[PDB]
Design an enzyme around this catalytic site. Structure first.
Site, PDB file in Angstrom:
ATOM      1  N   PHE A 174      25.717 -55.546 -12.549  1.00 20.67           N
ATOM      2  CA  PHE A 174      24.577 -54.963 -12.030  1.00 20.67           C
ATOM      3  C   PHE A 174      24.231 -54.262 -11.008  1.00 20.67           C
ATOM      4  O   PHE A 174      23.234 -54.867 -10.555  1.00 20.67           O
ATOM      5  CB  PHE A 174      23.542 -56.792 -12.452  1.00 20.67           C
ATOM      6  CG  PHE A 174      24.236 -57.390 -13.062  1.00 20.67           C
ATOM      7  CD1 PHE A 174      25.729 -58.565 -12.864  1.00 20.67           C
ATOM      8  CD2 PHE A 174      23.396 -58.010 -14.631  1.00 20.67           C
ATOM      9  CE1 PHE A 174      25.914 -59.045 -14.374  1.00 20.67           C
ATOM     10  CE2 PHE A 174      24.152 -58.904 -15.084  1.00 20.67           C
ATOM     11  CZ  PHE A 174      25.356 -59.347 -15.042  1.00 20.67           C
TER      12      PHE A 174
ATOM     13  N   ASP B 294      35.317 -65.576 -17.124  1.00 22.63           N
ATOM     14  CA  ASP B 294      35.410 -64.095 -17.056  1.00 22.63           C
ATOM     15  C   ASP B 294      36.524 -63.296 -16.466  1.00 22.63           C
ATOM     16  O   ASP B 294      36.311 -62.601 -15.705  1.00 22.63           O
ATOM     17  CB  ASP B 294      34.079 -63.694 -16.843  1.00 22.63           C
ATOM     18  CG  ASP B 294      33.740 -63.106 -17.068  1.00 22.63           C
ATOM     19  OD1 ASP B 294      33.969 -62.128 -18.342  1.00 22.63           O
ATOM     20  OD2 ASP B 294      32.606 -62.160 -16.641  1.00 22.63           O
TER      21      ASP B 294
END
Ligand SMILES: CN1CC[C@@](O)(C#Cc2ccc3c(c2)-c2nc(C(N)=O)c(C(=O)NC4CCOCC4)n2CCO3)C1=O
Length: 322
Positions: A66, A170
């Protein structure tokens, strides 16, 4: 009863302190307050505000998914490190509660966390080699020995986390950071982390779709083995230069992870037998049959020995993907 009072004493101020105080304060994040764990980042008169007590690098270049990770400098000390912005409204307590107090050379150290308005700014060591994701893109794909070498280091980090009943959640190339010479790899980004004892309930933000284990996508119960599947999807990414499943299937990939056999056909034929054997054991569909972190770290460690150890340079020549 005293924890109530300890927490109140941290609220409203940024202080120098220890990891357990940061964890206590972080829990109240579902106004400038925080705790800084290193002497290099110093508050000034109960505060630590952006562009006042610390500034990001000259033109604001951002990294991560991001663009939320930045090079920064404490104005008082001159010490440079890295900052990850997380929006307060979606901030997960576990991101700090997991990594706070950890101390392993295979996990990126936490330097502090300061809330300012709608942001939680999380500080950490700046590792100058860049992520393993950036290395794969630059080199096309990694040679086998270098791929094994980093997989082993990632698995060392996972042993350390799994022993403390922490799931990374993750695991992938973008979340492994390299030192400036390339020889040390460390796990970062605990935003999907989880304390242990299924995942699809309320609080959960899922990890990367391509690296998801079958029990994650079917909504079955999940333990530390989740990370191992991801680590082997990362192995395939390092070798092939592309994520598993992307080449063979276009539509929603989570439906194919559930139905199809594990992606062991994506193992290069030129890999050595124990490299292929290791990847197969970490990609077993049932977690009971799948290798643990310790088990897999040992095989990978011998797989590297079986191909003559780490020989190829960090940044060799470009090698074309599949
Ligand atoms: C222990 N902690 C505390 C916060 C934490 O949850 C995090 C994180 C995180 C997430 C994504 C990233 C990163 C961190 C990240 N960190 C760094 C770094 N620390 O240096 C970098 C990076 O590649 N930075 C430099 C590369 C060379 O040019 C200068 C910037 N990245 C880019 C890769 O995207 C966590 O795990």
């Amino acid at each position: 009863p005293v924890e109530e009072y300890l927490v109140h004493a941290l609220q409203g101020s940024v202080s120098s302190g220890q990891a357990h105080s940061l964890a206590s304060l972080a829990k109240t994040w579902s106004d400038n307050e925080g705790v800084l764990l290193t002497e290099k980042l110093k508050p000034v008169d109960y505060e630590y505000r952006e562009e006042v007590h610390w500034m990001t690098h000259q033109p604001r270049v951002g990294r991560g998914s991001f663009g939320e990770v930045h090079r920064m400098k404490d104005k008082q000390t001159g010490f440079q490190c890295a900052v990850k912005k997380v929006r307060l409204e979606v901030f997960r307590v576990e991101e700090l509660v997991a990594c706070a107090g950890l101390s392993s050379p295979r996990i990126v150290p936490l330097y502090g966390a300061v809330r300012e308005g709608p942001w939680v700014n999380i500080f950490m060591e700046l590792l100058e080699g860049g992520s393993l994701g950036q290395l794969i893109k630059q080199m096309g794909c990694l040679p086998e020995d270098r791929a094994l070498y980093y997989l082993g280091q990632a698995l060392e980090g996972l042993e350390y986390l799994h022993t403390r009943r922490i799931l990374h959640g993750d695991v992938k190339a973008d979340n492994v950071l390299l030192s400036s010479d390339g020889s040390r790899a460390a796990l970062c980004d605990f935003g999907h982390a989880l304390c242990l004892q299924s995942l699809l309930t309320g609080d959960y933000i899922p990890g990367t779709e391509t690296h998801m284990a079958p029990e994650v996508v079917m909504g079955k119960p999940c333990d530390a083995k989740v990370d191992i599947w991801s680590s082997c999807c990362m192995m395939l990414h390092m070798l092939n230069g592309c994520h598993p499943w992307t080449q063979y299937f276009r539509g929603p990939l989570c439906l194919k992870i559930a139905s199809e056999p594990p992606p062991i056909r994506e193992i290069p034929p030129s890999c050595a037998p124990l490299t292929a054997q290791a990847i197969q054991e970490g990609l077993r569909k049932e977690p009971v049959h799948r290798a643990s972190a310790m088990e897999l770290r040992r095989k990978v460690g011998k797989a590297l020995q079986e191909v003559g150890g780490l020989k190829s340079p960090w940044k060799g020549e470009y090698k074309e993907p599949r």
